[PDB]
Amino acid sequence: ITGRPEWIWLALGTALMGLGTLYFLVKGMGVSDPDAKKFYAITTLVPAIAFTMYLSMLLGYGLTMVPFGGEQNPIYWARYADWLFTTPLLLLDLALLVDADQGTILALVGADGIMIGTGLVGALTKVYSYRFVWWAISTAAMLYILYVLFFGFTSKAESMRPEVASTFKVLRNVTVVLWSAYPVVWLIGSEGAGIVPLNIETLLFMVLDVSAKVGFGLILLRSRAIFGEAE
Amino acid sequence: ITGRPEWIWLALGTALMGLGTLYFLVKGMGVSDPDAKKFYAITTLVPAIAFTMYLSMLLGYGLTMVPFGGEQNPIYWARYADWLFTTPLLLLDLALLVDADQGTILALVGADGIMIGTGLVGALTKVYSYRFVWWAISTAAMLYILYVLFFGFTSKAESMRPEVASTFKVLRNVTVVLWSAYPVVWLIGSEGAGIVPLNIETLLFMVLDVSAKVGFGLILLRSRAIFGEAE
Amino acid sequence: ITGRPEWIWLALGTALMGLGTLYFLVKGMGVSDPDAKKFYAITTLVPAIAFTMYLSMLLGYGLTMVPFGGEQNPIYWARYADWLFTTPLLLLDLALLVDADQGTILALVGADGIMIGTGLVGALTKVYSYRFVWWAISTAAMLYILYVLFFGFTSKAESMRPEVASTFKVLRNVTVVLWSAYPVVWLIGSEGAGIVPLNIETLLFMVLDVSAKVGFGLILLRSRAIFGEAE
Ligand SMILES: CC(C)CCC[C@@H](C)CCC[C@@H](C)CCC[C@@H](C)CCOC[C@@H](CO)OCC[C@H](C)CCC[C@H](C)CCC[C@H](C)CCCC(C)C
Ligand SMILES: CC(C)CCC[C@@H](C)CCC[C@@H](C)CCC[C@@H](C)CCOC[C@@H](CO)OCC[C@H](C)CCC[C@H](C)CCC[C@H](C)CCCC(C)C
Ligand SMILES: CC(C)CCC[C@@H](C)CCC[C@@H](C)CCC[C@@H](C)CCOC[C@@H](CO)OCC[C@H](C)CCC[C@H](C)CCC[C@H](C)CCCC(C)C
Ligand SMILES: *C/C=C(C)/C=C/C=C(C)/C=C/C1=C(C)CCCC1(C)C
Ligand SMILES: *C/C=C(C)/C=C/C=C(C)/C=C/C1=C(C)CCCC1(C)C
Ligand SMILES: *C/C=C(C)/C=C/C=C(C)/C=C/C1=C(C)CCCC1(C)C
Ligand SMILES: CCCCCCCCCCCCCCC
Ligand SMILES: CCCCCCCCCCCCCCC
Ligand SMILES: CCCCCCCCCCCCCCC
Ligand SMILES: CCCCCCCCCCCCCCC
Ligand SMILES: CCCCCCCCCCCCCCC
Ligand SMILES: CCCCCCCCCCCCCCC
Ligand SMILES: CCCCCCCCCCCCCC
Ligand SMILES: CCCCCCCCCCCCCC
Ligand SMILES: CCCCCCCCCCCCC
Ligand SMILES: CCCCCCCCCCCCC
Ligand SMILES: CCCCCCCCCCCCC
Ligand SMILES: CCCCCCCCCCC
Ligand SMILES: CCCCCCCCCCC
Ligand SMILES: CCCCCCCCCCC
Ligand SMILES: CCCCCCCCCC
Ligand SMILES: CCCCCCCCCC
Ligand SMILES: CCCCCCCCCC
Ligand SMILES: CCCCCCCCC
Ligand SMILES: CCCCCCCCC
Ligand SMILES: CCCCCCCCC
Ligand SMILES: CCCCCCCC
Ligand SMILES: CCCCCCCC
Ligand SMILES: CCCCCCCC
Ligand SMILES: CCCCCCCC
Ligand SMILES: CCCCCCCC
Ligand SMILES: CCCCCCCC
Ligand SMILES: CCCCCCCC
Q: Hey, which stretches end up on the Extracellular side (chains A, B, C)?
């Protein structure tokens, strides 16, 4: 484990995702509202999945070597197995908050799968220049997601209860800022141009992951928007 | 790229799926009917997924070598990753058109997963004679799907609006004819008996894919069956 | 095939899953109740999936070698591909029986995915002591599932029709007893401590699989709880 300088950030990430999972699990014990139960189930699964994948990276299972640039490059593939399941769950939290229609939910989840799937292909591609073709396709899929979150959901939240509109607006802004950083870290990190070393890259993804999952969840599950209007 | 004679058909397929995706995306911009939005989302995702997998084959990522018959045989595995997601989406288009019940939808999607999954196992199997055992199981799963589309959905469409009944009947006939060709191309192509060479096999799958996805989508999204009855 | 002593139990399992699939398929022909169709579709898919994965193990495709303990250990990875899809389908049978809320269904299916996913990682892990870390995480996920089936569903079934309450109680008890045996067989078998040899381990999993899928299905599909109350 300790033979890799980035191990400290993988261990911290593992701990923070595990602690986040347990807090949400305990906090959700005393909840019977069927609407609130939906948000607790979605939001608790997110850091639980991330916990297992951070642990796999810490123990060395989620790491492979990819030859490109005449070098064997360490690629943590477990990140994409994490994101494949956690990013659509996070979008479902937002879509259920605004009572989005089914067709829009399917478009979001499908574009998200394309985003993560093409990012994985780009991470494992051995022809250096082709890695950035996949990065560009994946980034186009992300821009579609961000467009929908702004010019489809925002207008839908305003016609909703005030507390669900204000909570959505906050979580929307958090998501757009944090998610946009991921393609940048990829491009300048060891998967892309190799400007930033792997140990610093790992620290950046850990800060982003914890903020986008645990921080996101703390804002959502403390809001009254997750409960139905009741007397 | 150009070192493979089949590259021209992979490049054409990539272009036609990309163009198809963009047309459906633009055409769906001016749509607010929640029913129509469902069909546009399903139908636009189909060629978008196929685009990415054709590109992976063009660039050489979606290709592996499988030893059988005393030879290293080029097997494009990316086809099955495509079909795993696009064939159930196409069946969902048909099932939603006739307002199929949930139990029937689950049976269709499950049989479809078995069809594609066993076809993938057959494509990667190293014992030559066993490849055709998997082909037979996969073909049995397809025949179940075709039976349901005829002796379960057809009777349901007649009790529906006339425009949804006539549109379903057309898309049903297109699907049964085109899908039935796939097991035949597999059997006589490089995955099976090896009668037809890979470059011709690739041309045939490209014609079938574009027809079953883009051609299918053009018929559906030009129909009024996708809109609810409104004044 | 016959070069492996466990082949006899893989062949028996294949036959019993295939026969089970055909019986459920025939029995479900004469069913039009939309509620009953749901249970028949879920319950017939379970042994059909298991059939294909037992066949892959029989023919040698679903087997790999994992080095640990200074030895190349035969690991049947196809079991986890089976369980990944069949265990959530079995939980869906139970959840639909008691009309569970959506949030609870998602929590069950998500915990089940974590259970199977971490068990697969543990089966393929090359550092011997780490294999049991994954076993423990997977077992914690199972205990969560069992808790929900007892202290969330049981109370919900009592407020239901008497026949659905008594049928659920029976299937609940069958599930908790049979599922609990799996982590024990893993721990003492070739994936874990290696006390029980592989051929005996394979026999035990076959008895458990057939009972948990075909036996489970025979109890459910003979009950009147799967039909709506009708005159
Ligand atoms: C509606 C939305 C959900 C739609 C989703 C969008 C999606 C279509 C976007 C594209 C996804 C696609 C790129 C997934 C590729 C997975 C692949 C990286 C797995 C590893 O295989 C890659 C190479 C080794 O580098 O295999 C070496 C050769 C091996 C012999 C490969 C044989 C196994 C194949 C991988 C079998 C295909 C399985 C499916 C891809 C499983 C789904 C994985 C997940 C990442 C989507
Ligand atoms: C309700 C419906 C959706 C049900 C679906 C029906 C489905 C059950 C039908 C059978 C599907 C099954 C054959 C999928 C097999 C995937 C497999 C080809 C992936 C590549 O692995 C094959 C060998 C190399 O040749 O791995 C070499 C050895 C490696 C060490 C393998 C270890 C990884 C395992 C593959 C882990 C299992 C992952 C799941 C199979 C992922 C789903 C893939 C998709 C193709 C279903
Ligand atoms: C809501 C719920 C459904 C959530 C589900 C819970 C889930 C997150 C729990 C953890 C699942 C995770 C451990 C799955 C790992 C699959 C992995 C074993 C496949 C084989 O790859 C392992 C190594 C060889 O040993 O690959 C060698 C290196 C290769 C180069 C690997 C590159 C391919 C990657 C495997 C791509 C990721 C694909 C996804 C993991 C596909 C889903 C598989 C299924 C088992 C979940
Ligand atoms: C909890 C994890 C989250 C919210 C991860 C989000 C990840 C992304 C938005 C990743 C995007 C990428 C691109 C847009 C292209 C480059 C490759 C990716 C996958 C890093
Ligand atoms: C857009 C792609 C489509 C509609 C693909 C359809 C593919 C099939 C219907 C494939 C069927 C197969 C068999 C029936 C057995 C032989 C292997 C397959 C997977 C080619
Ligand atoms: C039809 C198959 C069924 C119902 C299989 C159930 C399997 C389990 C409940 C497996 C549980 C495991 C653990 C709890 C940890 C050890 C590894 C597993 C996956 C065997
Ligand atoms: C979206 C965030 C990207 C900003 C990356 C900042 C990295 C600064 C760290 C110093 C770079 C290390 C280079 C010298 C080793
Ligand atoms: C009462 C609110 C705080 C509860 C404690 C939460 C502990 C989980 C770890 C959170 C750290 C990361 C927060 C986002 C920066
Ligand atoms: C379902 C369509 C299958 C028909 C295949 C027709 C192939 C004819 C092309 C000529 C065969 C090439 C053999 C000589 C190289
Ligand atoms: C107005 C209808 C035609 C629009 C142009 C569609 C261009 C997408 C490519 C379609 C070619 C394949 C059609 C099926 C044979
Ligand atoms: C949950 C069931 C686990 C019980 C396992 C009993 C196995 C007894 C078979 C004899 C053990 C073989 C050891 C000598 C070869
Ligand atoms: C009339 C009920 C029996 C029908 C025959 C079922 C045959 C399928 C194989 C069942 C054997 C396994 C039963 C569970 C132990
Ligand atoms: C194995 C991959 C299957 C999933 C394909 C994605 C489409 C799923 C459609 C689900 C239809 C709704 C069923 C109720
Ligand atoms: C990782 C594979 C999980 C999918 C298994 C297929 C069954 C899914 C059941 C979904 C139940 C409906 C939830 C609302
Ligand atoms: C185009 C939709 C408007 C909202 C999206 C904001 C774009 C942020 C740019 C992200 C940069 C990634 C490289
Ligand atoms: C048996 C259901 C009737 C409709 C299915 C038509 C069968 C077409 C044969 C396809 C040939 C594939 C080898
Ligand atoms: C803790 C929830 C109560 C019901 C679960 C029964 C636990 C059975 C123990 C299984 C042993 C697996 C190692
Ligand atoms: C080795 C660098 C080659 C540059 C390729 C950049 C491709 C980016 C595509 C974005 C449209
Ligand atoms: C090398 C050819 C061996 C023939 C096997 C055919 C199997 C087909 C099974 C269809 C029932
Ligand atoms: C080689 C045996 C090492 C023992 C590790 C046991 C780990 C079990 C963790 C359960 C909390
Ligand atoms: C609940 C605390 C979980 C912390 C265990 C993971 C941290 C790795 C320490 C080496
Ligand atoms: C929108 C046009 C997309 C065409 C790019 C793919 C074709 C491959 C050319 C080499
Ligand atoms: C319907 C009977 C299915 C039996 C075939 C599988 C058994 C393997 C025999 C070698
Ligand atoms: C993106 C930063 C999240 C901050 C988490 C703190 C929330 C406390 C209510
Ligand atoms: C299967 C052939 C499809 C033909 C596509 C043309 C549709 C234009 C309305
Ligand atoms: C767990 C044992 C199941 C027994 C199956 C027999 C059911 C006949 C109704
Ligand atoms: C009005 C809410 C502002 C939230 C933005 C937070 C950016 C990290
Ligand atoms: C909408 C604000 C985008 C912020 C992008 C930050 C990328 C590091
Ligand atoms: C009555 C519609 C006929 C459609 C069949 C088209 C076959 C390619
Ligand atoms: C229902 C007509 C089937 C046509 C099969 C064509 C196979 C090449
Ligand atoms: C295995 C075939 C079953 C025969 C019919 C059983 C009575 C519905
Ligand atoms: C009251 C029903 C008892 C069922 C338990 C069966 C254990 C195999
Ligand atoms: C609730 C009874 C548990 C039985 C466990 C059996 C494990 C072999």
A: 1-6, 60-76, 125-131, 189-200
